[PDB]
Write a structure and sequence with these properties.
Oligomer: homodimer
Distance between the termini of chain A: 16 Å
Structural class of chain A: alpha/beta
Largest interface: A-B, 27 and 26 residues
Number of strands of chain A: 13
Shape of chain A: globular
Chain lengths: ~350, ~400
């Protein structure tokens, strides 16, 4: 496929994409949301500060602590752009480019996650790094993107206690619905960390777990005076009516009872997909509690080779890790799809890599 | 019994109505705020927000037929929407401009606020009156200077004096709204060329043509466009709402034509912006040939109605109607009549909401801005006004 692979790095309408495994979702959550949308909006032809109150009861917080925006990354961009932000500490690898969000002459320092330990890290060493670097802002993505690994609440408590000196600790829990700390798959939430630690800000997407990629939605928990000052500097949101319908749906108890089953079903499919991927000879799949996995390709195989073979031979699109500093080797990120689609990806890769 | 006593009828309502939160947008007070304060108040005609109801019905009909009845709405809500570069390419076809010269965002005013926040912007010339405040969006070092439109000339933009003002002040950035946004007056392409030739020295001349689809220079109602100005004058930036003409309240879209280098730089910072599914559908609709044929019929129909509405308003003895080529008209009420009196009577007695000009600096006397609606709705407005403004008893 040499020619295709060169051009690709440089425009093929012969090319049909049949499975897009780049973007993140939950298809059981999508179907569920769309069921509600059809009943409540389509079959009846129905189709800004006050949005703070929507979620407050379900979250068990004051409406004053709730910031609504277009997405998790957009909110973190807002935070990191502020003048007070002059030195930030991040992990590598991360998927988003937080370095682009900070101001001129803001320094960013990076602590590497350990590929050899499945991109976990030594908690004591990381905290020593923050103690020695003295950043004013820390960003943690938990579960992390792109490898998907999750730090337990117990472990996060230890970290956050020790780093109580940092003015801001931002935790993006966008993927936390796919994580679990018990066999029963009780839904996890980082809201407890917002409550217990004055420096903590929580950010969370409402699109990657609820399966509404065409609607832009997210929230954060923050100090209420911080929210006021952001609103004075012009950052008031306004979500359309679709966004609004969805925000209200997602906190409704009757919806949530049904969503809980869609969520746990997807965790189980993520675990089945992973084991099936692990059955491919000569690949490894890093541990994940997200709606994606990161696969390390065999000796001498380039991601670009595998990506092009996937597109040309099977119409499957996956995401290269080559542009993500701190991912060792040649890797791909594969988004979870439906059962049928997941099987097709496993079958394609087995074939390609044999 | 006296006419003056009869005119204090709604005082209790008026006072409570004023107690409510004001804002700088189209509904002040907000519609959500009136429902809680006056829960029995039924709004039958909202003439505050700017739309073309004939285009809006057209677009909803395409949505119904193409998204709702087919179930294609499912994918619009569920799939990741296209990124900026792909949206540039959609607009390039129908705009006849290089894709990399197109910036797609939420609205004209949001785009102008992004422009004015840049650090090169250190002195800006604005006109007064204007509906949107732009002074809150400039950097703290930045100076703002105001060119005053004069009420005695119907707020007509005197182009020679403006140019001399710009030569004297040497702003690096100017904002022109054409047609202008609560009075509606429009400067011809002929006169815009003269102005822009003379102001070639200015770094950035931002022209908001969000209402230009409502103006006309010939009886055939040939659609006007400021793209000619973008193509000819290297200091021009064109900005345009796609929401106030293609008419689609809950989907917020606008574009700008500007230096491609500058767009490239903004897009390296960067994905601060994503369109939503429904936004994208509408954007791709708005440039289809077959849609545009029907849209053009709706645009011309709406201009014909606006002309009829303005003529009908001119028939009301004690108001002055300011000349307009937009989708709204500004009215000066007789002396001794407050806008608040008129606004309250319209709400209470007729369910009609119109926008006060009391909070817009530079607007003399007591004025209201009324958005042009359908023929039936316009008739109701004219009727309601005539009755409310009858000297009477």
């Amino acid at each position: 496929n040499t020619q295709f692979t060169k051009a690709f790095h440089a425009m093929f309408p012969t090319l049909e994409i049949k499975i897009d495994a780049c973007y993140l979702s939950n298809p059981y959550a999508s179907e569920l949301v769309l069921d509600y949308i059809d009943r409540e909006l389509i079959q009846t032809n129905a189709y800004q500060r006050s949005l703070q109150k929507v979620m407050a009861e379900s979250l068990h917080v004051k409406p004053e602590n709730i910031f609504i925006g277009n997405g998790a990354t957009e909110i973190i961009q807002m935070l990191l752009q502020q003048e007070e932000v002059q030195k930030v500490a991040l992990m590598i690898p991360t998927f988003s480019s937080y370095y682009e969000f900070v101001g001129k002459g803001c320094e960013v320092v990076y602590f590497p996650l350990n590929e050899r330990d499945d991109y976990s890290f030594d908690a004591d060493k990381y905290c020593q790094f923050i103690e020695n670097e003295q950043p004013d802002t820390v960003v943690l993505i938990n579960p992390n993107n792109p490898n998907g690994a999750y730090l337990s609440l117990e472990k996060m408590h230890i970290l956050l206690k020790r780093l109580a000196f940092v003015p801001r600790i931002i935790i993006d829990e966008s993927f936390i619905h796919f994580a679990y700390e018990d066999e029963a798959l009780t839904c996890l939430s980082s809201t407890v960390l917002f409550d217990m630690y004055p420096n903590v800000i929580i950010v969370k997407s409402l699109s990657k777990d609820f399966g509404i990629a065409g609607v832009r939605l997210g929230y954060a928990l923050m100090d209420s005076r911080k929210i006021d000052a952001l609103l004075e500097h012009g950052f008031l949101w306004n979500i359309n009516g679709i966004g609004e319908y969805c925000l209200r749906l997602f906190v409704r108890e009757d919806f949530l009872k049904r969503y809980e089953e869609a969520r746990k079903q997807y965790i189980k499919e993520m675990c089945r997909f992973k084991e099936a991927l692990l059955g491919i000879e000569n690949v490894y799949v890093y541990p994940s509690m997200a709606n994606f996995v990161m696969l390390k390709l065999p000796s001498r195989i380039k991601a670009s080779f595998v990506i092009s073979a996937l597109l040309v031979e099977y119409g499957i699109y996956v995401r290269t890790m080559a542009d993500k500093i701190g991912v060792e080797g040649e890797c791909i990120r594969i988004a979870g799809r439906t059962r049928e689609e997941n099987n097709c990806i496993v079958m394609a890769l087995k074939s390609i890599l044999k």
